Amino acid sequence: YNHVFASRFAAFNELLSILKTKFRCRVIFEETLVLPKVGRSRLHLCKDGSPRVIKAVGVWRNASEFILLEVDASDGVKMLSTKVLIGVNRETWQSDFERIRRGIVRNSLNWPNGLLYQLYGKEGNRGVNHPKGLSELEVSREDMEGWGERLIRELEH
Amino acid sequence: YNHVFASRFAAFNELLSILKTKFRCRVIFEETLVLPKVGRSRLHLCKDGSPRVIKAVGVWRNASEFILLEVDASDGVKMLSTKVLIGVNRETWQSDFERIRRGIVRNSLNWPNGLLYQLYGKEGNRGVNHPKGLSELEVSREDMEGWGERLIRELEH
DNA sequence: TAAATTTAAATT
DNA sequence: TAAATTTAAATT
Numbered sequence: 001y002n003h004v005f006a007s008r009f010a011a012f013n014e015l016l017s018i019l020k021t022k023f024r025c026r027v028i029f030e031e032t033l034v035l036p037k038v039g040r041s042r043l044h045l046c047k048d049g050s051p052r053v054i055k056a057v058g059v060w061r062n063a064s065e066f067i068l069l070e071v072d073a074s075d076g077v078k079m080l081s082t083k084v085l086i087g088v089n090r091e092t093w094q095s096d097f098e099r100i101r102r103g104i105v106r107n108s109l110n111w112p113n114g115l116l117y118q119l120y121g122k123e124g125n126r127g128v129n130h131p132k133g134l135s136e137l138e139v140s141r142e143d144m145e146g147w148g149e150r151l152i153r154e155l156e157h
Numbered sequence: 158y159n160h161v162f163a164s165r166f167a168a169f170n171e172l173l174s175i176l177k178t179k180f181r182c183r184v185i186f187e188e189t190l191v192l193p194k195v196g197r198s199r200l201h202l203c204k205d206g207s208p209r210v211i212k213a214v215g216v217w218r219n220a221s222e223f224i225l226l227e228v229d230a231s232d233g234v235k236m237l238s239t240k241v242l243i244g245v246n247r248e249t250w251q252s253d254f255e256r257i258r259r260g261i262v263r264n265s266l267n268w269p270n271g272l273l274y275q276l277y278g279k280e281g282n283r284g285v286n287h288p289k290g291l292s293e294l295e296v297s298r299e300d301m302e303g304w305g306e307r308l309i310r311e312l313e314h
Numbered sequence: 315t316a317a318a319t320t321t322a323a324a325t326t
Numbered sequence: 327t328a329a330a331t332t333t334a335a336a337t338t
Contacts, residue, residue, distance in 0.1 A: 039315070039316075040315070040316060041315095041316065041317090042316075042317075043316090043317075106316095108316070108317060108318090129324090129325070129326075131326090132325095132326065143326095146326080150325095150326085
C-alpha cells in the first residue's frame with residue numbers, strides 16, 4: 001500500500017531505502033548540515049525560524065559513485081529537485097560542498113547550476129524530480145519505486 | 158486607491174483604459190472568440206464547463222500598431238502572459254489568429270512560441286507579465302500603471 | 315541585493 | 327496524445 005510521510009524531507013530517506021533494496025545501492029556516507037547565512041539572506045532559515053538543512057549522501061552502484069543533495073523545503077517555500085552529482089572528488093568534496101551551500105542561499109534556494117556545471121560539466125550535473133503528489137505527503141508504493149527508477153536513468157546517461 | 162476585479166479577465170480591460178489615458182493609445186478593434194476544440198482536448202472549456210475565450214485587441218501608439226492577446230484563465234487553471242504581437246498584417250491576421258488559437262489548445266493553454274516566432278520573429282513575438290497580486294483580484298492604482306509602463310518597454314524594444 | 319510572484323519548458 | 331505536477335529562469 002501507499003506511504004505517508006511527516007515532511008518532504010522524510011520521503012528522501014525512504015528513497016535511500018528503496019535504492020538499497022530494489023536498485024542494489026550502498027550508502028557510503030550520510031551527513032546533514034545547516035545552510036549558511038550568506039549576506040542579508042533570510043531563506044537559510046525555515047518559516048518557523050529554525051536552521052534550514054541540506055543532506056548529502058554518497059552512493060555506490062555497479063562500480064560507480066554519485067552524491068545526492070537534498071534541501072529541506074518542508075516549510076513549502078520552494079520546490080527544488082534532488083541533485084545527482086557525478087564526478088565528485090573525495091580530496092575536494094568538502095570544499096566543493098561548501099561552495100554549493102553558499103550558492104544555494106545566494107540564488108534564494110536554487111541550485112547553483114553555473115557552479116555545478118563548472119564543477120562537473122553538463123553530463124555530471126544531473127538531477128531528478130520529486131514524485132508527483134509528495135506535496136500531499138502521500139506516495140504510492142509504485143511511485144516510490146519510480147523515483148528510484150528515474151534516478152537510475154540519469155546515472156545511465 | 159486600489160482596484161478590485163471580478164475575474165482575471167476583468168483586469169485586462171482596465172489595462173486598456175489606462176493605455177488610452179496615461180499612455181496615449183487608441184483601440185483599433187476588440188473581438189473575443191472561443192478557443193476551439195482541438196483533438197481530444199479539454200482545456201478549451203473552463204472548469205465550470207463554459208467555452209474558454211480569448212480577446213484580441215488592436216492598438217495604435219505613436220505611429221505603430223500591435224495586437225494584444227489575452228486568454229481567459231479566470232478559473233485558475235493556468236497563468237499565461239499577455240502577448241504583444243508586433244508586425245501583424247490585416248490581410249492575414251484572421252488566419253494567423255486562428256492558427257494561434259489552435260496552437261494554444263495543442264500545447265495545453267500555452268502560447269505557441271514556435272509559431273509566433275515563425276510569424277513575427279524573435280523581436281516581434283513579445284509579451285508582458287500580469288501584475289503581481291492579481292491572483293487575489295486586487296491591484297494598486299500604481300501597479301496598474303506599471304502594467305502599462307512595462308508594456309511600453311516591450312514596444313520600445 | 316534580497317525575497318516574492320509570474321511564467322513556461324519540462325516530465326511524469 | 328492529452329492533462330497535471332515539478333522545476334527553475336525570469337522579473338517585478
